[PDB]
Amino acid sequence: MIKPVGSDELKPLFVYDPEEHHKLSHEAESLPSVVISSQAAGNAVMMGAGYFSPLQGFMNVADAMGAAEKMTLSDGSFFPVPVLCLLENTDAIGDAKRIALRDPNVEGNPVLAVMDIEAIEEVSDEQMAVMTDKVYRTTDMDHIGVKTFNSQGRVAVSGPIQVLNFSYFQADFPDTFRTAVEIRNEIKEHGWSKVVAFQTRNPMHRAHEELCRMAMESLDADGVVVHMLLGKLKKGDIPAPVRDAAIRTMAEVYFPPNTVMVTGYGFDMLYAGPREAVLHAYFRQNMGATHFIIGRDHAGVGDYYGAFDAQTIFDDEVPEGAMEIEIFRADHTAYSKKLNKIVMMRDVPDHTKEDFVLLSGTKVREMLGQGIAPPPEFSRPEVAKILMDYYQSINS
Amino acid sequence: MIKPVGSDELKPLFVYDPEEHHKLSHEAESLPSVVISSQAAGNAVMMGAGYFSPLQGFMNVADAMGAAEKMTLSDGSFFPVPVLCLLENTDAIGDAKRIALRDPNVEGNPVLAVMDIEAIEEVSDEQMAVMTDKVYRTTDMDHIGVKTFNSQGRVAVSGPIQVLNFSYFQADFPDTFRTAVEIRNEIKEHGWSKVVAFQTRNPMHRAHEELCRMAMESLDADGVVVHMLLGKLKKGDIPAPVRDAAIRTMAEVYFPPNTVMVTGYGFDMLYAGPREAVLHAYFRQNMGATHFIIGRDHAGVGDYYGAFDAQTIFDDEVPEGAMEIEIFRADHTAYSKKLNKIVMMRDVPDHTKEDFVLLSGTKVREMLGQGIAPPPEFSRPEVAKILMDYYQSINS
Ligand SMILES: [Br-]
Ligand SMILES: [Br-]
Ligand SMILES: [Br-]
Ligand SMILES: [Br-]
Ligand SMILES: [Br-]
Ligand SMILES: [Br-]
Ligand SMILES: [Br-]
Ligand SMILES: [Br-]
Ligand SMILES: [Br-]
Ligand SMILES: [Br-]
Ligand SMILES: [Br-]
Ligand SMILES: [Br-]
Ligand SMILES: [Br-]
Ligand SMILES: [Br-]
Ligand SMILES: [Br-]
Ligand SMILES: [Br-]
């Protein structure tokens, strides 16, 4: 199968041996502890699940600066963004060098990981500014990711960690959450070799369903892994049970036998656009995908990034040979009146404007919300049923 | 796909809606609570995961007696064994009717479920005796399952429950544990229709590998679900990481593409032989299997059960039309010298004794433990490597 990034085998930090796991959980409860930031917690879950292989724990400032400035760590390995554990201070742990990291996102603040501290460093303004500007391509505090990065304090605690659980990401979504280790196992169980990954948080209307099918056909891929970013419900969001059902129904009814897996992972989105797209490729390679779809304004927010910047970063900023996964560059889809099917407009240079009909995901959901079925070119009835059954229970 | 037992859709008791899940977890921490038995905890996990669908919670004595005497509940539905929550007393909860059930198997005794108590009953000796004799077919306290059943107290607390997590079964085995809901989803993702399930706790040597392949061929099944019983490590047991690796390697190297899923579930084994075999068929139907393998002395212990009693119970004790799943009746395998392959001896009535070569799973493991490779007819090198690499790390 495709190799992991930077090693031959994945190096997850979750304690898979049950005896050692119980031992550590027991020791952890007696250790000095600190509640880390939601960002640091998601970083730990990704390392515990194998997504950030082969990282062994939280980076010191030299490695974080290297990831930010050159996507290169102090050992010369490739990694695209800093993976830090920033705190306001170290009051909570004083001089202890072995501590428990507690989860800010689960009531009671349970232990999430055990850490051996190798250094405690104060990040300077200059350094924080380089890490912010290089990753987010702006230092504007109105960019939510920039604000989040800069609202955790300046004390960087670095060293190796062992992870005890996958926070609320597995607890709340037991059927969807997967480690990179298990997605590789499932890809093999399916007998797939080339596999294209697609990230989504929204239910998939026909447009993204067709994008996945087009990419699978043009790449001659054996299957698609829909890899949902799992997280806390925000105002206006569609509840996961509904979103999950909508995507599973699309897979079950419209995809050929043995071509789609529906899964999820836990991390806090950076909204960093291009650099986050490189991170997305990195952990999709670790989970076993040979190809990853990146469309317009991938992982973006606001007006900070150019439409195709998250594709071109792979041509002009990612070091040569960094990864083995390939990018499938997507673009807007539409119904072609000439071909009577959904296409990416860029793939049919002979068409005219009047030859296409477009309906955005946003407009589709707006109609669904009013109990109106969009045209079949844009909405599958079985999927629409699920979403309208939901919307009518709250919009009536 | 095959329907669930007793309903058209599964009715798991896990709280899948995250908002309601957080609400209940929060309420639970303020409720009067009690640490239930390991048996009651496993019963709750099975109900939370959909395996015991459509049960809505713990049975009262009338339903438990009906399951024991006639595999039939007070509403006429089929269920083969009592699903009780027995306590020594109700001191811990007094007169509260809404309580939290805490887990005896996770340090700290975290909340596992919330329960609305509908009745509290004292089970009489006569009733305990009928439930023991009918399920275990012995009242001998030297039968470990009989002892366990009779060592939880006599106060039966009944009523509906909502389940908050899957105990240590998911926490310790995040990649293997599955709910019945997700195994159905994965079976569909694989595009399988007929599916044969096989339970094991031991790594699978060539004998059981070949049994699964024979059953898949004779049933024209699309795939096999290896469904491991997950649990705490006991003296002499092979650690799960090793066992899991041995089985995944067998699947990856020796099974055809897209024909095997490796999964697990959490429950405490009853060692009830025949009646437990009926329970195994019940929850395998709920997870989506159309066929379940039952070999000699399935789920037995000691000398309590006849070799094929766990097969014949389906002919003479299980009510007509109870379930839709079918049983694949297995028997001893051996290498046939005449056919130069592994066969079930019962399938080739023309052979003589000298025509077979047998090597038990126990003898295979004994050799592996000494660093000796059994013959290829009994041991796959890649699987043996995994097990010998393990044994040499502890037997040298
Ligand atoms: Br690996
Ligand atoms: Br944060
Ligand atoms: Br889920
Ligand atoms: Br290939
Ligand atoms: Br997304
Ligand atoms: Br949600
Ligand atoms: Br796009
Ligand atoms: Br839709
Ligand atoms: Br169902
Ligand atoms: Br027990
Ligand atoms: Br696991
Ligand atoms: Br069929
Ligand atoms: Br077993
Ligand atoms: Br173990
Ligand atoms: Br057998
Ligand atoms: Br073996």
mmCIF file with all atom_site columns, C-alpha atoms in Angstrom, chain A residues 192-337:
data_model
loop_
_atom_site.group_PDB
_atom_site.id
_atom_site.type_symbol
_atom_site.label_atom_id
_atom_site.label_alt_id
_atom_site.label_comp_id
_atom_site.label_asym_id
_atom_site.label_entity_id
_atom_site.label_seq_id
_atom_site.pdbx_PDB_ins_code
_atom_site.Cartn_x
_atom_site.Cartn_y
_atom_site.Cartn_z
_atom_site.occupancy
_atom_site.B_iso_or_equiv
_atom_site.pdbx_formal_charge
_atom_site.auth_seq_id
_atom_site.auth_comp_id
_atom_site.auth_asym_id
_atom_site.auth_atom_id
_atom_site.pdbx_PDB_model_num
ATOM 1   C CA . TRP A 1 192 ? -8.131  -1.481 -2.799  1.00 0.00 ? 192 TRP A CA 1
ATOM 2   C CA . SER A 1 193 ? -4.765  -0.209 -4.071  1.00 0.00 ? 193 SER A CA 1
ATOM 3   C CA . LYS A 1 194 ? -5.316  3.293  -5.464  1.00 0.00 ? 194 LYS A CA 1
ATOM 4   C CA . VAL A 1 195 ? -7.632  5.207  -3.198  1.00 0.00 ? 195 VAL A CA 1
ATOM 5   C CA . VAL A 1 196 ? -8.808  8.822  -3.472  1.00 0.00 ? 196 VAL A CA 1
ATOM 6   C CA . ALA A 1 197 ? -9.715  10.723 -0.277  1.00 0.00 ? 197 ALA A CA 1
ATOM 7   C CA . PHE A 1 198 ? -12.259 13.511 -0.002  1.00 0.00 ? 198 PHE A CA 1
ATOM 8   C CA . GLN A 1 199 ? -12.796 15.718 2.979   1.00 0.00 ? 199 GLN A CA 1
ATOM 9   C CA . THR A 1 200 ? -16.197 17.142 3.877   1.00 0.00 ? 200 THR A CA 1
ATOM 10  C CA . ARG A 1 201 ? -18.100 18.390 6.875   1.00 0.00 ? 201 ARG A CA 1
ATOM 11  C CA . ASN A 1 202 ? -21.359 19.128 4.985   1.00 0.00 ? 202 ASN A CA 1
ATOM 12  C CA . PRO A 1 203 ? -23.631 16.324 3.717   1.00 0.00 ? 203 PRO A CA 1
ATOM 13  C CA . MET A 1 204 ? -22.718 15.627 0.082   1.00 0.00 ? 204 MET A CA 1
ATOM 14  C CA . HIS A 1 205 ? -25.152 16.822 -2.557  1.00 0.00 ? 205 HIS A CA 1
ATOM 15  C CA . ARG A 1 206 ? -24.943 15.507 -6.106  1.00 0.00 ? 206 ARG A CA 1
ATOM 16  C CA . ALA A 1 207 ? -22.182 17.924 -7.027  1.00 0.00 ? 207 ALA A CA 1
ATOM 17  C CA . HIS A 1 208 ? -19.620 16.464 -4.616  1.00 0.00 ? 208 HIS A CA 1
ATOM 18  C CA . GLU A 1 209 ? -20.907 12.957 -5.102  1.00 0.00 ? 209 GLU A CA 1
ATOM 19  C CA . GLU A 1 210 ? -20.174 13.385 -8.848  1.00 0.00 ? 210 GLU A CA 1
ATOM 20  C CA . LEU A 1 211 ? -16.781 14.966 -8.160  1.00 0.00 ? 211 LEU A CA 1
ATOM 21  C CA . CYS A 1 212 ? -15.757 11.868 -6.172  1.00 0.00 ? 212 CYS A CA 1
ATOM 22  C CA . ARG A 1 213 ? -17.045 9.588  -8.922  1.00 0.00 ? 213 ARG A CA 1
ATOM 23  C CA . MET A 1 214 ? -15.240 11.633 -11.666 1.00 0.00 ? 214 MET A CA 1
ATOM 24  C CA . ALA A 1 215 ? -11.972 11.543 -9.755  1.00 0.00 ? 215 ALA A CA 1
ATOM 25  C CA . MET A 1 216 ? -12.288 7.832  -9.105  1.00 0.00 ? 216 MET A CA 1
ATOM 26  C CA . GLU A 1 217 ? -12.861 7.233  -12.844 1.00 0.00 ? 217 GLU A CA 1
ATOM 27  C CA . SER A 1 218 ? -10.100 9.471  -14.147 1.00 0.00 ? 218 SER A CA 1
ATOM 28  C CA . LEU A 1 219 ? -7.603  8.149  -11.633 1.00 0.00 ? 219 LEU A CA 1
ATOM 29  C CA . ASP A 1 220 ? -8.752  4.517  -12.110 1.00 0.00 ? 220 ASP A CA 1
ATOM 30  C CA . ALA A 1 221 ? -8.980  4.447  -8.285  1.00 0.00 ? 221 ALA A CA 1
ATOM 31  C CA . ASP A 1 222 ? -10.413 1.381  -6.560  1.00 0.00 ? 222 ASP A CA 1
ATOM 32  C CA . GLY A 1 223 ? -12.310 3.353  -3.967  1.00 0.00 ? 223 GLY A CA 1
ATOM 33  C CA . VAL A 1 224 ? -13.046 6.660  -2.259  1.00 0.00 ? 224 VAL A CA 1
ATOM 34  C CA . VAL A 1 225 ? -12.584 7.331  1.434   1.00 0.00 ? 225 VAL A CA 1
ATOM 35  C CA . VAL A 1 226 ? -14.945 10.120 2.552   1.00 0.00 ? 226 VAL A CA 1
ATOM 36  C CA . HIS A 1 227 ? -12.996 11.441 5.546   1.00 0.00 ? 227 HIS A CA 1
ATOM 37  C CA . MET A 1 228 ? -15.161 13.797 7.579   1.00 0.00 ? 228 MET A CA 1
ATOM 38  C CA . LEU A 1 229 ? -13.686 16.360 9.984   1.00 0.00 ? 229 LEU A CA 1
ATOM 39  C CA . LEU A 1 230 ? -15.549 15.584 13.268  1.00 0.00 ? 230 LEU A CA 1
ATOM 40  C CA . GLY A 1 231 ? -16.099 18.335 15.815  1.00 0.00 ? 231 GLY A CA 1
ATOM 41  C CA . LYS A 1 232 ? -18.463 20.161 18.166  1.00 0.00 ? 232 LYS A CA 1
ATOM 42  C CA . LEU A 1 233 ? -21.821 21.317 16.772  1.00 0.00 ? 233 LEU A CA 1
ATOM 43  C CA . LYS A 1 234 ? -21.864 24.994 15.838  1.00 0.00 ? 234 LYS A CA 1
ATOM 44  C CA . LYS A 1 235 ? -24.819 27.334 15.307  1.00 0.00 ? 235 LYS A CA 1
ATOM 45  C CA . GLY A 1 236 ? -26.639 26.354 12.149  1.00 0.00 ? 236 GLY A CA 1
ATOM 46  C CA . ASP A 1 237 ? -24.775 23.045 11.711  1.00 0.00 ? 237 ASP A CA 1
ATOM 47  C CA . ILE A 1 238 ? -26.581 19.897 10.693  1.00 0.00 ? 238 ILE A CA 1
ATOM 48  C CA . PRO A 1 239 ? -26.299 17.291 13.510  1.00 0.00 ? 239 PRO A CA 1
ATOM 49  C CA . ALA A 1 240 ? -23.832 14.441 12.753  1.00 0.00 ? 240 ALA A CA 1
ATOM 50  C CA . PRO A 1 241 ? -26.431 11.673 12.853  1.00 0.00 ? 241 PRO A CA 1
ATOM 51  C CA . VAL A 1 242 ? -28.242 13.431 9.971   1.00 0.00 ? 242 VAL A CA 1
ATOM 52  C CA . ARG A 1 243 ? -25.082 14.351 8.113   1.00 0.00 ? 243 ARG A CA 1
ATOM 53  C CA . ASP A 1 244 ? -23.756 10.808 8.512   1.00 0.00 ? 244 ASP A CA 1
ATOM 54  C CA . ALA A 1 245 ? -26.990 9.336  7.283   1.00 0.00 ? 245 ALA A CA 1
ATOM 55  C CA . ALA A 1 246 ? -27.095 11.615 4.257   1.00 0.00 ? 246 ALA A CA 1
ATOM 56  C CA . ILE A 1 247 ? -23.589 10.609 3.206   1.00 0.00 ? 247 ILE A CA 1
ATOM 57  C CA . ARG A 1 248 ? -24.070 6.878  3.867   1.00 0.00 ? 248 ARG A CA 1
ATOM 58  C CA . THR A 1 249 ? -27.292 6.910  1.860   1.00 0.00 ? 249 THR A CA 1
ATOM 59  C CA . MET A 1 250 ? -25.548 8.616  -1.055  1.00 0.00 ? 250 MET A CA 1
ATOM 60  C CA . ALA A 1 251 ? -22.813 5.916  -0.883  1.00 0.00 ? 251 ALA A CA 1
ATOM 61  C CA . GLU A 1 252 ? -25.241 3.025  -0.569  1.00 0.00 ? 252 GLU A CA 1
ATOM 62  C CA . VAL A 1 253 ? -27.617 4.023  -3.301  1.00 0.00 ? 253 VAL A CA 1
ATOM 63  C CA . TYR A 1 254 ? -25.410 5.706  -5.885  1.00 0.00 ? 254 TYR A CA 1
ATOM 64  C CA . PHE A 1 255 ? -21.942 4.256  -5.743  1.00 0.00 ? 255 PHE A CA 1
ATOM 65  C CA . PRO A 1 256 ? -20.954 0.936  -7.282  1.00 0.00 ? 256 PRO A CA 1
ATOM 66  C CA . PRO A 1 257 ? -20.398 -2.014 -4.965  1.00 0.00 ? 257 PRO A CA 1
ATOM 67  C CA . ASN A 1 258 ? -17.196 -1.806 -2.936  1.00 0.00 ? 258 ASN A CA 1
ATOM 68  C CA . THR A 1 259 ? -16.090 1.717  -3.847  1.00 0.00 ? 259 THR A CA 1
ATOM 69  C CA . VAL A 1 260 ? -16.730 3.983  -0.795  1.00 0.00 ? 260 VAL A CA 1
ATOM 70  C CA . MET A 1 261 ? -15.854 4.070  2.893   1.00 0.00 ? 261 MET A CA 1
ATOM 71  C CA . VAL A 1 262 ? -17.434 6.691  5.206   1.00 0.00 ? 262 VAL A CA 1
ATOM 72  C CA . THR A 1 263 ? -15.101 7.702  8.042   1.00 0.00 ? 263 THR A CA 1
ATOM 73  C CA . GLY A 1 264 ? -14.031 10.625 10.200  1.00 0.00 ? 264 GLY A CA 1
ATOM 74  C CA . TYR A 1 265 ? -11.121 12.096 12.159  1.00 0.00 ? 265 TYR A CA 1
ATOM 75  C CA . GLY A 1 266 ? -10.713 14.614 14.958  1.00 0.00 ? 266 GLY A CA 1
ATOM 76  C CA . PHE A 1 267 ? -8.657  17.827 14.763  1.00 0.00 ? 267 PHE A CA 1
ATOM 77  C CA . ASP A 1 268 ? -9.446  21.543 15.039  1.00 0.00 ? 268 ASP A CA 1
ATOM 78  C CA . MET A 1 269 ? -9.492  23.148 11.585  1.00 0.00 ? 269 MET A CA 1
ATOM 79  C CA . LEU A 1 270 ? -6.798  25.828 11.139  1.00 0.00 ? 270 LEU A CA 1
ATOM 80  C CA . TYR A 1 271 ? -8.577  27.692 8.299   1.00 0.00 ? 271 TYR A CA 1
ATOM 81  C CA . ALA A 1 272 ? -5.099  28.182 6.876   1.00 0.00 ? 272 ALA A CA 1
ATOM 82  C CA . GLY A 1 273 ? -5.962  27.478 3.334   1.00 0.00 ? 273 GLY A CA 1
ATOM 83  C CA . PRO A 1 274 ? -2.929  26.397 1.248   1.00 0.00 ? 274 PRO A CA 1
ATOM 84  C CA . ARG A 1 275 ? -0.673  25.260 4.127   1.00 0.00 ? 275 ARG A CA 1
ATOM 85  C CA . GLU A 1 276 ? -3.608  23.385 5.690   1.00 0.00 ? 276 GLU A CA 1
ATOM 86  C CA . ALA A 1 277 ? -4.200  21.718 2.321   1.00 0.00 ? 277 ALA A CA 1
ATOM 87  C CA . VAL A 1 278 ? -0.582  20.414 2.474   1.00 0.00 ? 278 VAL A CA 1
ATOM 88  C CA . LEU A 1 279 ? -1.255  19.113 6.013   1.00 0.00 ? 279 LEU A CA 1
ATOM 89  C CA . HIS A 1 280 ? -4.439  17.426 4.707   1.00 0.00 ? 280 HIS A CA 1
ATOM 90  C CA . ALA A 1 281 ? -2.387  15.640 2.006   1.00 0.00 ? 281 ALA A CA 1
ATOM 91  C CA . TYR A 1 282 ? 0.172   14.572 4.621   1.00 0.00 ? 282 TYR A CA 1
ATOM 92  C CA . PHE A 1 283 ? -2.288  12.779 6.904   1.00 0.00 ? 283 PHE A CA 1
ATOM 93  C CA . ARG A 1 284 ? -4.320  11.358 4.002   1.00 0.00 ? 284 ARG A CA 1
ATOM 94  C CA . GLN A 1 285 ? -1.096  9.657  2.838   1.00 0.00 ? 285 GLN A CA 1
ATOM 95  C CA . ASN A 1 286 ? -0.649  8.262  6.394   1.00 0.00 ? 286 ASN A CA 1
ATOM 96  C CA . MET A 1 287 ? -4.143  6.837  6.326   1.00 0.00 ? 287 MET A CA 1
ATOM 97  C CA . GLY A 1 288 ? -3.441  5.013  3.040   1.00 0.00 ? 288 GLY A CA 1
ATOM 98  C CA . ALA A 1 289 ? -4.746  7.248  0.289   1.00 0.00 ? 289 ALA A CA 1
ATOM 99  C CA . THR A 1 290 ? -2.787  7.590  -2.966  1.00 0.00 ? 290 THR A CA 1
ATOM 100 C CA . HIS A 1 291 ? -4.722  10.670 -4.055  1.00 0.00 ? 291 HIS A CA 1
ATOM 101 C CA . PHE A 1 292 ? -6.393  13.614 -2.333  1.00 0.00 ? 292 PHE A CA 1
ATOM 102 C CA . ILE A 1 293 ? -8.985  16.003 -3.821  1.00 0.00 ? 293 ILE A CA 1
ATOM 103 C CA . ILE A 1 294 ? -8.318  19.733 -3.457  1.00 0.00 ? 294 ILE A CA 1
ATOM 104 C CA . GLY A 1 295 ? -10.869 22.113 -5.023  1.00 0.00 ? 295 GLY A CA 1
ATOM 105 C CA . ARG A 1 296 ? -11.170 25.884 -4.900  1.00 0.00 ? 296 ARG A CA 1
ATOM 106 C CA . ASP A 1 297 ? -10.374 27.763 -1.694  1.00 0.00 ? 297 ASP A CA 1
ATOM 107 C CA . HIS A 1 298 ? -9.681  24.516 0.090   1.00 0.00 ? 298 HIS A CA 1
ATOM 108 C CA . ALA A 1 299 ? -9.528  24.984 3.853   1.00 0.00 ? 299 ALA A CA 1
ATOM 109 C CA . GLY A 1 300 ? -9.892  28.744 3.416   1.00 0.00 ? 300 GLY A CA 1
ATOM 110 C CA . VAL A 1 301 ? -11.829 31.430 5.222   1.00 0.00 ? 301 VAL A CA 1
ATOM 111 C CA . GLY A 1 302 ? -12.715 34.999 4.359   1.00 0.00 ? 302 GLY A CA 1
ATOM 112 C CA . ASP A 1 303 ? -10.913 36.610 1.455   1.00 0.00 ? 303 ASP A CA 1
ATOM 113 C CA . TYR A 1 304 ? -7.364  35.626 2.403   1.00 0.00 ? 304 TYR A CA 1
ATOM 114 C CA . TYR A 1 305 ? -6.570  33.097 -0.266  1.00 0.00 ? 305 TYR A CA 1
ATOM 115 C CA . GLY A 1 306 ? -6.705  32.940 -4.065  1.00 0.00 ? 306 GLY A CA 1
ATOM 116 C CA . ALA A 1 307 ? -9.016  30.259 -5.500  1.00 0.00 ? 307 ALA A CA 1
ATOM 117 C CA . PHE A 1 308 ? -6.349  27.845 -6.646  1.00 0.00 ? 308 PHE A CA 1
ATOM 118 C CA . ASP A 1 309 ? -3.583  28.739 -4.153  1.00 0.00 ? 309 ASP A CA 1
ATOM 119 C CA . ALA A 1 310 ? -4.187  25.535 -2.197  1.00 0.00 ? 310 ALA A CA 1
ATOM 120 C CA . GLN A 1 311 ? -3.348  23.613 -5.419  1.00 0.00 ? 311 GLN A CA 1
ATOM 121 C CA . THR A 1 312 ? -0.384  25.673 -6.561  1.00 0.00 ? 312 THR A CA 1
ATOM 122 C CA . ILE A 1 313 ? 1.341   25.567 -3.198  1.00 0.00 ? 313 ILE A CA 1
ATOM 123 C CA . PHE A 1 314 ? 2.277   21.985 -4.205  1.00 0.00 ? 314 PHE A CA 1
ATOM 124 C CA . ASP A 1 315 ? 4.089   23.367 -7.256  1.00 0.00 ? 315 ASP A CA 1
ATOM 125 C CA . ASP A 1 316 ? 5.946   26.213 -5.655  1.00 0.00 ? 316 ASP A CA 1
ATOM 126 C CA . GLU A 1 317 ? 6.364   25.854 -1.889  1.00 0.00 ? 317 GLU A CA 1
ATOM 127 C CA . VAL A 1 318 ? 6.214   22.141 -0.956  1.00 0.00 ? 318 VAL A CA 1
ATOM 128 C CA . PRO A 1 319 ? 9.790   20.724 -1.052  1.00 0.00 ? 319 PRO A CA 1
ATOM 129 C CA . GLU A 1 320 ? 10.491  18.352 -3.894  1.00 0.00 ? 320 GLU A CA 1
ATOM 130 C CA . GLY A 1 321 ? 9.810   14.714 -2.952  1.00 0.00 ? 321 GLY A CA 1
ATOM 131 C CA . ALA A 1 322 ? 8.128   15.568 0.346   1.00 0.00 ? 322 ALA A CA 1
ATOM 132 C CA . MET A 1 323 ? 5.319   13.086 -0.095  1.00 0.00 ? 323 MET A CA 1
ATOM 133 C CA . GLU A 1 324 ? 4.144   10.203 -2.263  1.00 0.00 ? 324 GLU A CA 1
ATOM 134 C CA . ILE A 1 325 ? 0.433   11.090 -2.315  1.00 0.00 ? 325 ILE A CA 1
ATOM 135 C CA . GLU A 1 326 ? -0.782  12.957 -5.407  1.00 0.00 ? 326 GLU A CA 1
ATOM 136 C CA . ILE A 1 327 ? -3.295  15.753 -5.607  1.00 0.00 ? 327 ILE A CA 1
ATOM 137 C CA . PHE A 1 328 ? -6.449  15.614 -7.729  1.00 0.00 ? 328 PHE A CA 1
ATOM 138 C CA . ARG A 1 329 ? -7.138  19.242 -8.608  1.00 0.00 ? 329 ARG A CA 1
ATOM 139 C CA . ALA A 1 330 ? -10.833 19.940 -8.606  1.00 0.00 ? 330 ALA A CA 1
ATOM 140 C CA . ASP A 1 331 ? -12.868 22.898 -9.792  1.00 0.00 ? 331 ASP A CA 1
ATOM 141 C CA . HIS A 1 332 ? -16.528 23.931 -10.060 1.00 0.00 ? 332 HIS A CA 1
ATOM 142 C CA . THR A 1 333 ? -19.056 21.372 -11.296 1.00 0.00 ? 333 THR A CA 1
ATOM 143 C CA . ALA A 1 334 ? -22.266 22.075 -13.218 1.00 0.00 ? 334 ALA A CA 1
ATOM 144 C CA . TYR A 1 335 ? -24.937 20.275 -15.218 1.00 0.00 ? 335 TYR A CA 1
ATOM 145 C CA . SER A 1 336 ? -23.933 20.310 -18.906 1.00 0.00 ? 336 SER A CA 1
ATOM 146 C CA . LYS A 1 337 ? -26.981 20.700 -21.120 1.00 0.00 ? 337 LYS A CA 1
#
